[PDB]
Design a protein around this nucleic acid. Structure first.
Lengths: 219, 221
DNA sequence: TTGGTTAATAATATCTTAATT
DNA sequence: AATTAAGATATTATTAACCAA
């Protein structure tokens, strides 16, 4: 929710900030690029709203923002609304081009859409993240080499944490033709998980409950 | 990049399809929500361009459908009624952009291209790696590498989805006109040519294979 | 018995070439 | 350049023997 605005009109700059704050956005402000590039250096801003028109290096501005702070969105506001200025701003890297006099109902809607994030299937528990989409596990910032069916078994359990899952359940949930395989696979997979993480990373992620099943228990 | 065009006006539909094909995009055409959704189910589209006023089917409904079915598909709404309420509604419904009809195809293509950069610049610059999709050129340390065609498009698509896993089936839908006809091995051969021209000679790790998922660009490594 | 623990080996995936186009 | 065919090679999955309790 961090947006910084680079506008040399004080009125507009004042205006723009008050609108963003009203919406809910943490915001910073600059009247020149010099100061602006400074802020992006200190902390990340989800989006940057800057004027195309003092130094007149907007095309370069977009580039420098994308370089210094690659994850940020650049929105360019310009009173010259001709196709040439629109096309040239987008072609320079701008993620969106808005037109001033500013419609703040439309602007807020575009910023929103520009910072809309898709729902994820990612699981973050304490210093551990488990990303099914990328088949990735990291604890304490280090990747864990766990994949395949052991990966699915761990993720399944994580999704049903504090709940006891049974071999049959895991098999049906993760194994096609579950009635054509050796249940030993579950035990082997659990060992793999303990081996890859529990053991080397000194944690207790999976717990076995006699005659009932396993349960993710990483507090 | 594959673009799904949903538009009832048959004449406009073909004009849009022709402008996109000319640019170099793979394109499918539809004239109703149903047909559109059909395509959304069989093929992966990097971007859907849909009229807010189809003969049937709430525009908001269409946006939700595509966004849920394919969260990473960009949605762009076109409407001759382009008052503020309409634009804001579409954006809030989940659209990433809203453009007024009659379309200025110069600005349309500039905006489509800005959405498909996934936040990037036109010229990808990573470390001493340069990938210029505009000149189909690649440089490393200012030294030129000859890589063109499908392999070039496979690599640029990966590097734009960098650090993400793109499946063989996604690479095909994005670069091949008829992904169903071609064999998935074509992707593996392209990845071999990419490694054969870059990773091996330049001693770098750019494409990571992830078994059963696909390929991921990891040049930063 | 129950679970875990190893290890080999069968499956399955991906890659690399060479040819054809 | 583009696509495929086939074997080469890599990587999981499966299976079972084995151990401890």
């Amino acid at each position: 929710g961090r947006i910084l605005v680079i506008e040399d009109e004080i009125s507009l700059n004042k205006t723009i900030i008050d609108n963003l704050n009203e919406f809910g956005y943490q915001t910073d402000s600059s009247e020149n690029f010099k100061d602006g590039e400074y802020f992006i250096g200190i902390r990340h801003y989800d989006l940057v709203l800057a004027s195309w028109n003092p130094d007149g290096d907007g095309a370069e501005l977009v580039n420098t923002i994308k370089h210094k702070s690659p994850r940020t969105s650049v929105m360019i506001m310009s009173a010259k609304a001709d196709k040439d200025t629109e096309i040239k701003a987008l072609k320079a890297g701008a993620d969106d081009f808005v037109k001033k006099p500013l419609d703040f109902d439309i602007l807020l809607a575009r910023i929103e859409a520009r910072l809309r994030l898709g729902g994820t299937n990612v699981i973050k528990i304490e210093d551990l993240v488990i990303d099914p989409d990328e088949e990735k596990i990291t604890y304490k910032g280090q990747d864990i080499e766990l994949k395949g069916k052991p990966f699915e078994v761990l993720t399944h359990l994580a999704r049903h944490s504090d709940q006891i899952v049974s071999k049959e359940q895991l098999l049906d949930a993760i194994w096609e033709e579950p009635e054509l395989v050796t249940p030993n696979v579950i035990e082997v997979a659990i060992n793999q998980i303990r081996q890859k993480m529990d053991k080397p990373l000194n944690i207790s992620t999976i717990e076995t409950v006699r005659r009932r099943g396993y349960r993710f228990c990483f507090p």
